[PDB]
Amino acid sequence: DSLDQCIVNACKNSWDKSYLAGTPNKDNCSGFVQSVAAELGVPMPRGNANAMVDGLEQSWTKLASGAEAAQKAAQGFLVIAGLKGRTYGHVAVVISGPLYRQKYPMCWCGSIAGAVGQSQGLKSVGQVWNRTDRDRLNYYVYSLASCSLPRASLEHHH
């Protein structure tokens, strides 16, 4: 497995869970991120997307760009893209992968909005968020990598 496989694994595993009991994570951006963090053992601010962004802004390291965000995810860190909204905010997990338009990283996220706000790693943050918002995203990274060493039994090239 890749060094960052635990991030994608936690995303896949969180999709059909219901962090808010009764509401599938695919239909709840905050719940999706909470379930990913819980699987990885990363403490996370509580509440709706806006409250979570408030908490991340107060306590997490912020990255300078979506490119940096993908780079940190590739090293096995949990990286959250977030933006507050006047009514509802949105949060997503950034994963390694090619940058859309040379700028916007791939992501996983659920959304009460439905399919337009959902990504199972196949949309970038620049496709999920509005054109008026995608250049205003905040990227937060946890202080320690969540993934472990590869299995000791792994045979690989030198």
Q: Which two tokens stand for residue 20?
A: 């808010």
CATH number of the domain encompassing residue 155: 3.90.1720.10
d(CA 93, CA 106): 9
Strands across the sheet containing 119-124: 61-63, 138-141, 79-83, 90-94, 106-109, 119-124
| Annotated catalytic residue within 6, 11, 29, 107 | 29
> Residue 156: is it exposed, middle or buried by C-beta count within 10 angstroms (0-12/13-18/19+)?
exposed
In terms of residue numbers, what domain contains 109?
1-158
* 6 catalytically annotated: no
d(CA 154, CA 96): 21
Solved how?
X-ray
20, 56, 79, 120, 129 from 138: Cα distances, Å: 24, 10, 10, 20, 12
| Annotated catalytic residue within 90, 107, 109, 147 | 90
The answer to whether 82 and 138 are in contact (CB under 8 A) is: yes
- In sign, the C-alpha dihedral spanning 56, 62, 68, 73 is negative
Neighbour-count burial for 56-94, b at 16+ CB within 10 Å, e otherwise = beeebeebeebebbbbbbbebbbbbbbbbeeeebbbbbb
The answer to whether 81 and 123 are in contact (CB under 8 A) is: no
The answer to whether 79 and 141 are in contact (CB under 8 A) is: yes
* 29 catalytically annotated: yes
What resolution does the deposited structure have, in angstroms?
Answer: 1.4
Domain count within the chain: 1
Task: List, in sequence order, every residue forming a beta bridge with 119; answer none if it has no partner.
Answer: 109
Q: Which two tokens stand for residue 33?
A: 């991120």
